[model samples]
Target chain A: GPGSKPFSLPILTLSELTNSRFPVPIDSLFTAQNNVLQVQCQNGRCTLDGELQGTTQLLPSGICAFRGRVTAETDHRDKWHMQLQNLNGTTYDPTDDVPAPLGTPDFKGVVFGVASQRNVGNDAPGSTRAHEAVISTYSPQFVPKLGSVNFRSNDNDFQLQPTKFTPVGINDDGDHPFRQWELPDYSGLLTLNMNLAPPVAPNFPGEQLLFFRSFVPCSGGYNQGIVDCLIPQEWIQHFYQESAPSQSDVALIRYVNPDTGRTLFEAKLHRSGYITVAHSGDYPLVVPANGYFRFDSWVNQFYSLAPM
Target chain B: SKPFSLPILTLSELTNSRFPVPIDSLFTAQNNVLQVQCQNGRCTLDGELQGTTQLLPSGICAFRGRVTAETDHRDKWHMQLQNLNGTTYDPTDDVPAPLGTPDFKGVVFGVASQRNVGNDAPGSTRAHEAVISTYSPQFVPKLGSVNFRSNDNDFQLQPTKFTPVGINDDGDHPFRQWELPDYSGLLTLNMNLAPPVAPNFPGEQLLFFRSFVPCSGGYNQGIVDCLIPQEWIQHFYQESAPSQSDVALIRYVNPDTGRTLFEAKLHRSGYITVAHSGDYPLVVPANGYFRFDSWVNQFYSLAPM
Candidate 1:
């Protein structure tokens, strides 16, 4: 909770989201709790540059994303006037007595969104906007986790559906047969392989499908490391290029809520961001599945689950 | 139905509220934002603020800030991922696009931006319309010229498109592929970068920095997993750059405690090797972040490209 004194609020950025190696930066504006914060703008828009800190953290790097309470205000309530207090209006100016014009009405709490510095096509660094959309919520807005993205999945067969397939377990000792699907601690790197044997599935003939939601290590992180899975890029490319248009083969990803064992989001290949897949299956038509990959034709898809 | 947490209107504070108001009249009960019942003699603003993930209109808000370069931990890095539970496993981890998806996934990119490469440097301000996911290449396969897929970009994710680094669609490696097996050792892809201009290379040597998957093994390659130092540097700068000093240094920084894992001087082409490799820490709650120091050298490099 922010008091009258100025305090540093933590924020996450797109750079940090795409690249884990970056540090979380703090916003430059100071605010008292449950009050509006402001930034000076140029040509009505403000585009800031990226910054880092002496330690691992950096000052607000890109657009400002705050972590305060979601305000109980809306767009239509213009009657509620928001006047400057503690600080002066035309605040960007040095004059202390001069009150700034009536600023837009906003809630007092953390704000979250991504912004850029350059214009529509200009690559140079500069401010681009003044106000971004804000929202109200129950939980303080923190950077979203993997399950944040809705990993939607689609399939007629339950074999590859995340809803039906229990996350595979690893047997470090290989003793308990039932726990074969479980892992030792769900730590370190995990490589999942499927042997490609033509007609791997008995029910289907020409149409072959291979699927597995990205591997999430033991819940609540067993080991303090990343779970690196091998990508089935080779197998995917081969399967897609050689198969008949009528015979479809696809690879997709989905986000699931472990607490509910439900899929929050999903995406098929080529429909999302930049990516490439490979196929390593031996059979021209059949892909290796269950007890077949390591020994025969193998297919793989790679993804990682890092410490939250 | 929502629960109330705090007094809707701080009586003492609201009476002296600096801003003007049209709430002299009262209204009936409503949700968190609209529970305003005002009257001349007695008045009250009901409902408390609840948590949410949507954006509300706040006229317009703005702030001024700058970007800077800081010293980072020697062996640690900020990591991000796609799985919530897994991301929770490590603090400073991120969620990148899938390995083979094309076009930006979700919505906005560059969640935030700042100016001044350093705290004391010059500052600029602005933003744009396209908020897309950004990433870079970090691995390479063994064979056909470069030995990676046609679009070798999805191996990683970032906030903006690769500017300092470039991509080559002319890759000839049809059979070359990358892998990351389950239950293996840590796979580190050291970024060996080159400048965009000045001291530049012939053709699209930017191809050098384009990361690729290990030729045969990265996933479940062996029990002890790590990129051999020499193989790593040579993987990108073998025939082109003659010596370490000839190329830009890749600074290993820890996102947790913003500090460089290895000093810049120690990053020589031939000198540093597997001995430099270290197992870094994963992160928690606050999304963790870490990065390389290409900007430091490029900005300071008098040698140009």
Candidate 2:
């Protein structure tokens, strides 16, 4: 057969998605580009950078042209706050209407789960507009362009942790901002004290649990609850869906440093561990260990006591 | 640099004098045997691995996993490691099936363990059907690999399987099919079935699992093309018989009935490896259904958690 051609990826900008909102203008101070949405591109595809809540499905076509209701709180007067999903549901009250200002209790999980409830996003026009939508399901026929990658065990050296840590920004390294003499600034070991398997029948062989440490520090402070992981259900589902599934059941936790894309440390729990697949529960809580914390992006699995 | 003087002295000769071989020292024993001796250097072992081994200045501890002996001529010696029960020396040495030596079989896909199809989106109707098509048209890979995930719209909106859907630098009239079993979401397809059956070289199967992807619309309709992820290509190099074999071999089988679905010999001509594409022409099973699986020759290794 002849007449095949090279593949080109489709681009979907965040600005178009956001601006797609018509009828009512988004003049409610939520006007900056990065403030409205954030994204990063990889291998010709773009991924949403952080938690984003939209009235519309942002990525594959449809644009939520109308602005959704936003209950403003004097505390968070000009701040933008969002509450995302955990396995079960939202950690906070999504309909609370008004989000307390920065450092306010209600604004805890907002702004990538950082310190102040209020985030200082760039207010520049279109600055809040995001320009990326890469992780969409395409026609299986185009899968060849998707490319195949190897994911084995034995060849890589990484120090991975199950639970997470957080960094304030790209170079935060788990710090609040720039290192100040008064504010804490340093790196600490991140660990998780939870099960990695489902309950019921234990001692099953072919179960793999591996942890890793990434080169990039967690950007946001560690928002323990519902650690931003693929989640057990998704993991199990993806496992079964693999056209080439492995005999071993793997529960892998990766700590990626996006800056350099190198794994610093990694660990694996073979079979017979007392670990269980993640379930709803609150472990313990503490402030950021040192200068940085393993940012939990998904949702909080544990409630935060207070900032360190 | 500099060689030892003409009097080429041996450790034994030096041990007979003041130096005494400095207690724990490494020396090429008679017959090229590597041995560590501990006559009484600064380092000593109370109850280390063996009764005669000791820690040395080189910072390495010794284990008597093997026994050594010097020949009567004192010039010839031998050492053999004692095999430990339930123990393994090299994990990479015995990588499960489809991975190790050339004489072996591998699996493709479908359901395994029968009833227990791992986790799911619940009942049948709620979840969208999963589909897969092969790129087995003899001269397919001459293009590239095939896609695993496809579509930008909703679930049902996409094709049930991945087949000849796009276009690319590699030509196409692609049409690869396989005998599929009509089963639920899971099943185990045995890799032992296939033509060119072993001993009968060309009769056996060579499953190739490379890479694939899709484009927007228009021009490249159903083309399967791409350079596999770095790690995949690396393994292809590591596992294949260099110089003679091509880069891939994907095994497909019938989940319910241990039967062969399809496989092909994608090769390199005059040093040019064909860009993988299409699949093999196959007949569907009357009772069960059809499905796809991935099988590769694995070598022990670790990946990012």
Candidate 3:
């Protein structure tokens, strides 16, 4: 009898860091302040504005990284710390007030942080503490789930070349035996380490390649309702330097009919680090032979697909 | 094959002058203006008709009638005798008549001037220089004339003998044949008569006289089996401005019944597509006439000329 064939798992690489910005509320859970704060990085430096300050560097493996501290305001005492880095072959303990790895088969951008706040005497009795973590990639590179099919951009700006290697499947789950490659859905703040080469210079001062979705309570001096907030910004050299918190950049992947050239379905990729596909019809999604996925941007990557 | 002449003789010396003489007797007197005279119980002829010779005959013999020359539609000359009375020759028999059969001879005459001496000719009179005789049994008009005039700038002249609307017959009949007048001379006279002007803007619907298929029985019963004029289709396409597509609503209507047999969509590509549904086949009878209608109003609404 023939032996079982060998197989490799899907892999992703973090090629670059496009942005670094995280959103938070000003009053934590104490007051319905409706105001927000930003944990952002610019010019290879990270800061929580008046809250915390940090710096970034490039690892030997070419991954952009950051690490910083959280401190108490009254006594200048250290309260917590945060960091974003690649933990491959490193003895980083996940239980030591840190975020978990993204659990990808290879190449993950891991982020973790602990935040705490307390007031001195004669202040309100409210105190706040929170654990925040995220795993994402900048300039994300991955093997496409459908392998490399021919794709054309909407503007015909580029051509896609198929990957030379054969697609691989995962057997990490012993009982399940085979698993398809997929990414988890995430919605929250992220701290991008700006240590890699920059893309084309942004047109506007606040123009960014990444953004976070933040819910800010409507303002009428009271809690009316919650509305999405834009990216944080401040007046710098007499001009606002960053995009508003409410605006988030996005791109689309459209699957089209090869014969009629009509769009059959669309997968929306949000700058907030998520992919969403909504199907309203009863029919299952089908990508016919010779059909293509048209990306809004020049996506140079590989992908594959298989039935589990 | 040789030319010869008869013997010459004088009038007095001839045995008989009462009978017409041959060319030999008149040859000597035929120069310039031959003169003839008669006086006092004797008669003599000379000097052509020049200088007016008076002829007095004995025994109550007098010339009282006038003879005039006229030409007819066949271009043959006729000597009309008029005003002769009580002479035993019937003047009533001298009515105008068509020339029977024409006989061509090799004789030709040269004239300095020609004049009509009687009543002036009417404006509609035509002096036909040539006559074409047809042996066919069917009678055809000599000429076809069309006088097209309109108060409005737009008009249509269909070849149908009957009006397009208010007809009792179903609208499935073909248009009557009409031979249009030749405009070669008119066009030659006006060199600046340019071709039909192109529309200044797109989507301008121009009125046209086109042949279309009528509905056979009722709406959606299907169009009558007929052929539309290919010339009109080509002209329509050429006149239409470029567009993604052009469509018009066509209606086959019976003018007598005022009922629309059926309606169809007329595409600029010369396709007439019928949608048979709901109130389609609006009438039971076939229609012999059809017209086009745009989305807004009736197209080609001009009256027939």
Candidate 4:
């Protein structure tokens, strides 16, 4: 990035797919405008931040637009929280609903054992709406322009978590909004403790355990479980199915700066993302599409990332 | 910086750099003439895990195993580790109809046992599959220096096997996780079959053992030690010829574990070296880190756990 200033990245990427929901609106953009906006055009490069886990089949949260886009112009409630292009690379979820609960819990083998709850998300839409995410699946034959991206962080305090549902299809035209609601803010440093594995092994090695939990302070100065990060499975599921699917997580004794509620210290298992393939096994969770010729833009991501 | 433990001043192990040679400390000699009996037996240890050429035209899949005994006998122990021909989809290395070295293919026959003794054992045979070239006595620096046990035949061991997780970058494929076999207690070579092999030069296996946890520390008491690559003899004896003629070499892995240790290098002259004997020795100060992973295993033996 020459005139394009080189950027340094804290490089946060927590792509644990398990039970996480894919927050996306069936808002179809002109697939023809594939290059409408460069990443650095307006918002420049907006950072994708969140934590996710588990798996789910649906999040029938009210569609960003219950009807078509025309009626929502006057309803301020119809505005989005965050938005991005939602292309299904593989076309759609491989395990279709077939008039059934499709794409439900994909990974098994002891998830989070058992624990008490630690969460604070159900907040009213104070002023902003939620944001939707754009997604893409990897395709071999599909070249460039096979995907689209349009996200919005314009509103001041509109926070939102990712969704777990995949788009209905491109045919559901003029029937979607651009974004969803914002994620609620809770105090006490975030802690995580989870166990995640690829649905299908990726191109990487084995040992892809997704374990993380957040350490929330006691509600009324009553310190209960410290050594045990007892974050109920429900909250983890909420974040995964209702919000974004790739959020940051860690399970540890939280020594939050009582005054700031920010992380003071944390420890975690080792998973060198890009070093040697000795630690990982499966990769790029492939999400296929609905009908024939519905190739690229099928699923959202390649847990088994396709090398660019 | 080193963890404050290493052969401080190994002159023969130095690369183009010079150590401060402790002018004050009197480094006394521990031993002198290293004399011992040379055992005669050979096994094939490949540099690459899998190779597919035109003439032979078959993909050679490789894996490493160890040889271990319940007793503390490192003096004389023999187990079998052989190259099963064809691909794993065909049970190549486990069964029969073996093939020789990549260039020396005509020498066929599958199951090879390093030693079972006196030609009377189950799979012991005199004429082996591969025709390994041998060189006279010489200290090849940096790459091909072979070491042997003078006492009898002891396998050099400790090899960690793994498969892929993802390809992070061109030369940076991050492993999914680490699943190590509990070879007895201390990484002793499993004598059930032969010991696992190590890739040399082009072959490097990624290994991570829990970093030695200091009993005294609290938080760190439960964490793994920083991982670093060991078994890199090429630093000291690269390109060096075999000590005695016609013998495969050995290196012990996880000195902490006695069982998981095995041997490698069947034909001394079978491989090539990048460094010259006269060249300086390449040495690691202590626990310096380097990359060592098996791309072959990444494609083969690795399964989801």
RMSD of each: 30.9, 30.3, 49.5, 28.3
What is the model-wide C-alpha lDDT for candidate 4?
0.18
Candidates 1 onward: DockQ, in order: 0.03, 0.01, 0.00, 0.01
Which numbered prediction scores highest in lDDT against the true structure?
3
How well is each residue in A54-128 modelled by candidate 1, as lDDT tens digits? 111111111121111111222331111111211110122213221111111011221222111112123321212
Stronger candidate by DockQ (1 vs 4): 1
Candidate 2 lDDT, B1-305, residue by residue in tens: 11111111111111111010111121111111222111111110111111111111111111111112333321121222211110222322221111111110111111000011124331111111111222212111111111122121122211111111111212242221122111111233223221111111312222211211121112322111111111122112222323222212322345457775543322221001111222322233333221212222222111211
Our tally of clashes for model 3 stands at: 37
Model 2, DockQ value? 0.01
* Candidate 4 TM-score over all chains jointly: 0.16
Candidates' C-alpha lDDT: 0.18, 0.18, 0.21, 0.18
Weakest 10 consecutive residues of candidate 1 chain A by summed lDDT: A160-169
- Candidate 4 local lDDT, B151-267, one digit each (tens): 222222311011000011111221111211122223232122222222333332222212111111011111121111111121112113222333233222333333323222222
For residues A1-308, what per-residue lDDT tens digits would candidate 2 score against the true structure? 45432211111111111111110001111111111211110101111121122121111111111111112212222222122221111132323321111111100111111110111124221111111011101111111111110111121211111101111112122222321111110011132211111221213233221111111111123221111111111111112222222223322222234445543322221221112222122222121111111112221213221211
For candidate 1, the per-residue lDDT at B191 reads 23
Which docking class does model 4 fall in? incorrect
Weakest ten-residue segment in model 4 chain B by summed lDDT: B16-25
Q: Name the candidate that leads on DockQ.
A: 1
Clash number for candidate 4: 149
Model 3 complex DockQ against the native: 0.00
| Residue ranges of candidate 3 with Cα displaced over 4 Å | A1-88, A93-98, A102-253, A257-261, A281-283, A295-308, B1-305
Of 1 and 3, the candidate ahead on TM-score is: 1
Docking quality band of candidate 3, CAPRI definitions: incorrect
